Amino acid sequence: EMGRPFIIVKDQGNKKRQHGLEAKKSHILAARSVASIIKTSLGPRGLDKILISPDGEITITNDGATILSQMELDNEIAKLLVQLSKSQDDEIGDGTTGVVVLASALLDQALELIQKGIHPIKIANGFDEAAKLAISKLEETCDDISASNDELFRDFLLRAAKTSLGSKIVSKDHDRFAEMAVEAVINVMDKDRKDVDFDLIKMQGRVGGSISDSKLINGVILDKDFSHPQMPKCVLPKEGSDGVKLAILTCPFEPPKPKTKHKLDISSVEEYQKLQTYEQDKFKEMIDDVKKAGADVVICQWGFDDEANHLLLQNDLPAVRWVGGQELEHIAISTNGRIVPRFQDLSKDKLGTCSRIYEQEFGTTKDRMLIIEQSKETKTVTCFVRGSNKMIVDEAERALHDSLCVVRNLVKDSRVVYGGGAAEVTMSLAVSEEADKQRGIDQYAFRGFAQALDTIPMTLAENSGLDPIGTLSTLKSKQLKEKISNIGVDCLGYGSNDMKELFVVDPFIGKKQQILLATQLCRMILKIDNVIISGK
Amino acid sequence: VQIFGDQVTEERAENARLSAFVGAIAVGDLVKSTLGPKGMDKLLQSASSNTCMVTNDGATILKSIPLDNPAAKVLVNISKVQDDEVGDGTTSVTVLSAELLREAEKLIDQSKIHPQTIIEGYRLASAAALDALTKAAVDNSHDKTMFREDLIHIAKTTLSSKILSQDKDHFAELATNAILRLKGSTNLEHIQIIKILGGKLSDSFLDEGFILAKKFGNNQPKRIENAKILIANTTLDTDKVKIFGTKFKVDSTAKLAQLEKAEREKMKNKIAKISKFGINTFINRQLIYDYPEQLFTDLGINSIEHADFEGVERLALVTGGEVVSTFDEPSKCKLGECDVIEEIMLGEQPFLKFSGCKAGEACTIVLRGATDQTLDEAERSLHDALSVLSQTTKETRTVLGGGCAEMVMSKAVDTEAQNIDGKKSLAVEAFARALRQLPTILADNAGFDSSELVSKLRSSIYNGISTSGLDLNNGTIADMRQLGIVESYKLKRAVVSSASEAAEVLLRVDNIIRARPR
Amino acid sequence: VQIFGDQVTEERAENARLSAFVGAIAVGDLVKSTLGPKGMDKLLQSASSNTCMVTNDGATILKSIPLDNPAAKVLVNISKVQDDEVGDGTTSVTVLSAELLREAEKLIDQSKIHPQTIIEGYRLASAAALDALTKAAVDNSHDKTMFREDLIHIAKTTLSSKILSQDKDHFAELATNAILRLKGSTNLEHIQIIKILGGKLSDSFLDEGFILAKKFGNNQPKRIENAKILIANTTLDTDKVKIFGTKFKVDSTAKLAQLEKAEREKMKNKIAKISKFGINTFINRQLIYDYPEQLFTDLGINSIEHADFEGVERLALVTGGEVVSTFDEPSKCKLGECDVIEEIMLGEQPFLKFSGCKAGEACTIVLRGATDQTLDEAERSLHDALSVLSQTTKETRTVLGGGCAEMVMSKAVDTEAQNIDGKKSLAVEAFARALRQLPTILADNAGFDSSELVSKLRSSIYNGISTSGLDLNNGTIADMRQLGIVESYKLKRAVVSSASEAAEVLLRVDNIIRARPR
Amino acid sequence: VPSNATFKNKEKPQEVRKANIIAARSVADAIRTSLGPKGMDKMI
Numbered sequence A: 001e002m003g004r005p006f007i008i009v010k011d012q013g014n015k016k017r018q019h020g021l022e023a024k025k026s027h028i029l030a031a032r033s034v035a036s037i038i039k040t041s042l043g044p045r046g047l048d049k050i051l052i053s054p055d056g057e058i059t060i061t062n063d064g065a066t067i068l069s070q071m072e073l074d075n076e077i078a079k080l081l082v083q084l085s086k087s088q089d090d091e092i093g094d095g096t097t098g099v100v101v102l103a104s105a106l107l108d109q110a111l112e113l114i115q116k117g118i119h120p121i122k123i124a125n126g127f128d129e130a131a132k133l134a135i136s137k138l139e140e141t142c143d144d145i146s147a148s149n150d151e152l153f154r155d156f157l158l159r160a161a162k163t164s165l166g167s168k169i170v171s172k173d174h175d176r177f178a179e180m181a182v183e184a185v186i187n188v189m190d191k192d193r194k195d196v197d198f199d200l201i202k203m204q205g206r207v208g209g210s211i212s213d214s215k216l217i218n219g220v221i222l223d224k225d226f227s228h229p230q231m232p233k234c235v236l237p238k239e240g241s242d243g244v245k246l247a248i249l250t251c252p253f254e255p256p257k258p259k260t261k262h263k264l265d266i267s268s269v270e271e272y273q274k275l276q277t278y279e280q281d282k283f284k285e286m287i288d289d290v291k292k293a294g295a296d297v298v299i300c301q302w303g304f305d306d307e308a309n310h311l312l313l314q315n316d317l318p319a320v321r322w323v324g325g326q327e328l329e330h331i332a333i334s335t336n337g338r339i340v341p342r343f344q345d346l347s348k349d350k351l352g353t354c355s356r357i358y359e360q361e362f363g364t365t366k367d368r369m370l371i372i373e374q375s376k377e378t379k380t381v382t383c384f385v386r387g388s389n390k391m392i393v394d395e396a397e398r399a400l401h402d403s404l405c406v407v408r409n410l411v412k413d414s415r416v417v418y419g420g421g422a423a424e425v426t427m428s429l430a431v432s433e434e435a436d437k438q439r440g441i442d443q444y445a446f447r448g449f450a451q452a453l454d455t456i457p458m459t460l461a462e463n464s465g466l467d468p469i470g471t472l473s474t475l476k477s478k479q480l481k482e483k484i485s486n487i488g489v490d491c492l493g494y495g496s497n498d499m500k501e502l503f504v505v506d507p508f509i510g511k512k513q514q515i516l517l518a519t520q521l522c523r524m525i526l527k528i529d530n531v532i533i534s535g536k
Numbered sequence B, C: 001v002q003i004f005g006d007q008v009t010e011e012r013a014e015n016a017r018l019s020a021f022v023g024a025i026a027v028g029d030l031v032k033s034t035l036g037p038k039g040m041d042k043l044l045q046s047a048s049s050n051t052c053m054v055t056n057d058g059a060t061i062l063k064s065i066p067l068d069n070p071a072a073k074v075l076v077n078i079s080k081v082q083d084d085e086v087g088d089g090t091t092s093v094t095v096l097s098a099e100l101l102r103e104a105e106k107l108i109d110q111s112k113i114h115p116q117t118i119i120e121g122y123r124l125a126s127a128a129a130l131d132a133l134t135k136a137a138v139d140n141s142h143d144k145t146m147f148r149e150d151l152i153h154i155a156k157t158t159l160s161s162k163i164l165s166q167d168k169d170h171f172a173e174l175a176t177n178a179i180l181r182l183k184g185s186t187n188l189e190h191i192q193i194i195k196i197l198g199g200k201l202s203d204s205f206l207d208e209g210f211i212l213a214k215k216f217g218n219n220q221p222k223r224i225e226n227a228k229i230l231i232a233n234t235t236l237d238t239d240k241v242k243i244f245g246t247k248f249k250v251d252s253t254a255k256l257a258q259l260e261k262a263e264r265e266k267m268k269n270k271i272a273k274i275s276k277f278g279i280n281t282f283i284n285r286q287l288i289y290d291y292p293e294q295l296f297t298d299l300g301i302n303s304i305e306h307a308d309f310e311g312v313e314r315l316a317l318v319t320g321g322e323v324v325s326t327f328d329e330p331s332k333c334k335l336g337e338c339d340v341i342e343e344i345m346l347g348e349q350p351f352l353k354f355s356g357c358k359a360g361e362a363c364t365i366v367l368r369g370a371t372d373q374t375l376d377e378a379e380r381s382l383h384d385a386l387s388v389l390s391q392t393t394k395e396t397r398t399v400l401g402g403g404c405a406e407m408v409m410s411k412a413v414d415t416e417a418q419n420i421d422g423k424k425s426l427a428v429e430a431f432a433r434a435l436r437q438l439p440t441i442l443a444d445n446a447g448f449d450s451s452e453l454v455s456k457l458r459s460s461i462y463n464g465i466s467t468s469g470l471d472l473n474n475g476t477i478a479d480m481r482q483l484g485i486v487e488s489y490k491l492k493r494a495v496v497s498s499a500s501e502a503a504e505v506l507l508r509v510d511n512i513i514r515a516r517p518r
Numbered sequence D: 001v002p003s004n005a006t007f008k009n010k011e012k013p014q015e016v017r018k019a020n021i022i023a024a025r026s027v028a029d030a031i032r033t034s035l036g037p038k039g040m041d042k043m044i
């Protein structure tokens, strides 16, 4: 110091540092603080958790990404775990909780190896070689399902659909949600059974009713009523016709005006009466254009005034207002129609086709929500989910979203594996076997990853209330006795640790992604030596 | 290592379940007094502007009161959905869902049952519960006279809980006539409840017509006969053309005198097209200015101004006509009819009385009561009464109440508990014992015994009489068909499903995370 | 109005009650984990001076923790006096008192029974319980071998919950041998607890004679064979003469030198009076000055100074002689004899060990351990054991333990529950469920299923046999006479009587008046 | 198999025992450096 103010970085006294062994203990214990939150949540016997936002709204969730997303944290090590769960949620949409506890399992076993004095790069290189070795083994042992016909391929989705719904609420009606989830993909799929578009199916929840009232409808959900409700609510098609002849327009019902600011000057009373004639003839020509086109229901983007209500009512033409542009993207794909810009380009080939249009109340005074249904298979399915609470229907959205994502993973060819703790133990005993001859300096590194994989079965043992040591001892001895590797920890106690029989399947791409994100983050956290953090 | 920020309350221990369970018990005990016919009304003291509010419904109470517990929000939200869905039975969901968590508390503490086992028993117990209502219901659709009698007894049951327990004999006829008036339209927005303070509570009535809140403008008469009603939604007053870029290039003010005259000529021409229909009354939603008002005087047409858009829907259906605009084509357009129109006065504000209309697809109810709080309670009651009776038309099946609905569920639930031998039987019995408490609090509010009176109802049903129930005026068991009280199937289906699923929420919670307030 | 003034909390009949019951729940849940053999010890951190305290006794847990709740102060005081009376069983009073109020909370809410009616059921239920407890007891002390064996079983049952649960087979001999050496004298002041750091828990050995932490003088020898022991409550210090108010007027310092000669000659003649008996040691209560200390050298007398008040009686009873101060008449006051007066060292502090005394009416328990927190637990553990076994000498009747005393008492209560008419019979059954909840908690702390063992124990005892009990090591029902589990009759009588009075005080409450604190 | 004979409530003793173990081990890490001939001295 030598008396002068010895300052280097701006805000010297505010920020701190941390190094040596104490920096590591702050990292591993920070992961254990997050792992204790996730450990009591994972598995079918888990428990939900309430996340209170600053605005007073709550969300009852048991998925690791939504928990960590709405969690106000200060430690940076947990903030990387917040993004790891979000990484698993965005792409695969399965295993968020698993990655958080698996990455902590690698971190917890790494704490013992740091005490022995192994360099962190040798620790990180050991998990990288062990992770690829486990992926290379699990890719050989899993079987392909593409040889079976379409009748049995539907059953494999039901195996994974019941797996994803369970462990979540919506696990009662889960037998019908599995059929409803599989029925959504039967309508929306490619003929070659590959690269299905997920953006065609959007999520839509409704606060009201009960879970039993939910059903399948192929159409669009609009949160609005028809214009001037004097007409009958449920419009029917003609006796002989191809359909209702849906019409969509991105032009409001008005006289044509320039987009630029204009100044229409009327210097005479004769020109003023022609403006009155021009005002009326445009509305007369407009309703005659849609009349000759044969449209029954009209969808307008930018709304219209009250003059067109009576012209549309007399001709038996329902209509709506303030339909957003995102919904028109959904209407054109569902009804297979083309959106015309204007009336001069109006033609009968661009109009859509759907079965029927109708509206119901759902209760007393809530709001009139529009419903559309198709008479055949189309490229659009809109799940109509009901719920007794706002948190129930909110959790049912992200639960069913993960269900469709798990089925989306199975659309990829030859990616199936039987889970239930079997995938963890079958990848664990081989790593310990390789260490016996690949000893080197990294012998304990393989043993750490072998013990870290087994923690997820022990996590299931804690939630199910069984003895962990007796469970892992029986599974390890059974895997050594017989090379059949589809036996896992069954929590619902249906008897039989065997599992193809229970029907538990998880996607192969999802399971290998667990150790990848876990190992890839553990390689990053172990590199940190200096921890500089500034004050808020 | 405190990963969370400053001022972050987290509970990851037994206190989390205790804090979530005690919150529902506090919300549960708050509404125990409001249940039943002998229940006491409650009083709300607002924090802003001293605006008091007297209400018996639990949905309005719990939404108004502030509660920071996350468990309280679930009881607030399940009551809001029940208030919006059916409009009745909100306090039953609040007290039953809290009692299910109350009964589930001792299983967690004393017997040490897993939370997944308690919900698993409630799944099978709720399944057998709804199956009891499948066989216990009765369809009275084959006869309209019996269905007319069913709407009476449902009005007797719903209106008895509110302050109108004495005057329910008169409003039961008023309530059922409004439903037969609507002839199946379950939209509650088509009934205008005009609030009038003063007079006796039994002075309410239901006139065959639509009562306006406003009067005629300047000189149009009060009493007329054989008036043709025409409704319009367009401006009809100083017509600002659809493009606002219009202008007048005026070279001299003498020509601008002709332009303003031309605006009066087209308006004079528009009113001339109204006279082609040959009408005597004209109604428009926009407020009418002076110039078009004057031209109706010579034609002998009445004018009403500033009608609300929600009232135009009620006005069109009572009159039976149609809202007409673009008056060049009078042939295709339709207009209503009425026998007599007369302006009346109920209190200080005058109103327009319509009577003798052809269509009767809507009505208006005029309430008369001492205070604005009693009048408001009346509105909340009739709204809850008409909401249940409106859904009774689409859901014709009904269920007998008075403790018989909860007990016949428990008769089937207790039967199924033996065929599921193991530890799940205690959970199903807890669901059964939770249903016994609804007739218990109904007896406690009237000041009767909780054990002996429920014990007599227990023995009466197992003997082979599925029509026995509680009678509170005398304090003994009586037949429900003779007394004439019955609820709808959608109501009992809703409260059992809402209270069941509400118990599933706060049983799957172990950790409570509280971030900072904003 | 406001008569009580500012900052005065008042409660009335719904805030008054349910604040004591939740306080009874709050104080009961703390001591729930400490009950039984598999109970976990609670650690208490002081607010000042960073003083920690490891303790299992429920009284000591409530002594240190501050509790502003008035209802919890009742449980604080009843554990204090229970520790004063018996010394063991304070946790059972707090648990049984809390569960009696937990049951009575449900009888007031669910069954809607008056509080006075609940007490009248508890009076008859407590009378039936004590009558069954009196008849279930068994006589003892007729055979000294059986009396020796029962004290060993009582010591094993007492130390099973403390830290000495693993070494109770060895400490039972140490506990019971000291009590028989008292020769009927019931007093705990005759037993010393010397704190020694080092060793392990099972290194505590039985001492022959009496040992204490004192030291010889500067010039005294190490060993004297067959030493005569004397105890002086005397002042061998600067005696002064006691007519305070004596001063010395001096005309010349010649006689003042002879006056100081007389002071030394005065004390010389006093030490010469000691040598007339021919003793070998001299024990004084207070400090001995150097001039008396030098005079014991040539006469062959040992010297021990600064003896505590308790140490005088503790050493005199082992010696057999009486405390002498006058030293005038050598005829009376026959002294004892000790063979080995050689001191030993246990740790870093030498202790004077005696052996081969006339009588052993006072004893000393030498303890070895690692941490002082464990030695403090060792002190409180054996203090409860020696207190129970000391009162077992005067009160001979005993009763079987292992949870059988609770269920056999509830058998007569359930038998007398049927013939009592009215609503108080439910309160009589509530008392029975309170007795049943103690063995329910014994199975919870051990980690085994509680409903099965309580159901098997309850069904087994009603068959006709009354010797069955809970075996928490194996997790099944077994014979208590084989395992050797028995407790005193006055212990369970005090627990049931104190718990009955505990519920009676808190159930007769209707208002709370909390004045302003100083 | 599952949902029988027990349910482990009051997991705060498990959380407290973990906090006491890591608290004792963190103090032991400072004393661990002073072991053996190649240990170091401490000034307080």
Ligand SMILES: Nc1ncnc2c1ncn2[C@@H]1O[C@H](COP(=O)(O)OP(=O)(O)O)[C@@H](O)[C@H]1O
Residues within 6 Å of the ligand: A041, A042, A043, A044, A062, A063, A064, A093, A094, A095, A096, A097, A098, A162, A163, A164, A166, A167, A168, A419, A420, A421, A489, A490, A491, A492, A504, A506
């Ligand atoms: N019904 C079931 N039977 C057996 N195992 C299941 C069942 N449902 C889920 N699991 C297992 O529980 C583990 C954790 O899944 P979970 O945490 O619920 O999914 P996510 O991590 O995507 O939230 C998975 O490895 C899976 O194998």
Ligand SMILES: Nc1ncnc2c1ncn2[C@@H]1O[C@H](COP(=O)(O)OP(=O)(O)O)[C@@H](O)[C@H]1O
Residues within 6 Å of the ligand: B034, B035, B036, B037, B088, B089, B090, B091, B092, B093, B157, B158, B160, B161, B401, B402, B403, B442, B470, B471, B472, B473, B485
């Ligand atoms: N006169 C009566 N006799 C017998 N039972 C009655 C009588 N009046 C009301 N009840 C009972 O009291 C209950 C009142 O419920 P209610 O207060 O309407 O619930 P909520 O207010 O939650 O809709 C009904 O279930 C009905 O069976």
Ligand SMILES: Nc1ncnc2c1ncn2[C@@H]1O[C@H](COP(=O)(O)OP(=O)(O)O)[C@@H](O)[C@H]1O
Residues within 6 Å of the ligand: C034, C035, C036, C037, C056, C057, C058, C088, C089, C090, C091, C092, C156, C157, C158, C160, C161, C401, C402, C403, C404, C442, C470, C471, C472, C485
């Ligand atoms: N070895 C044992 N086997 C079975 N039960 C025991 C055993 N030791 C004690 N108990 C039971 O524990 C209960 C309370 O023991 P106690 O010594 O009073 O503990 P505390 O001093 O903490 O109150 C007694 O009722 C007794 O039945």
Ligand SMILES: [Mg+2]
Residues within 6 Å of the ligand: A094, A095, A163, A164, A167
């Ligand atoms: Mg999942």
Ligand SMILES: [Mg+2]
Residues within 6 Å of the ligand: B088, B089, B158, B161, B384
């Ligand atoms: Mg009601």
Ligand SMILES: [Mg+2]
Residues within 6 Å of the ligand: C088, C089, C157, C158, C159, C161, C384
């Ligand atoms: Mg004891």
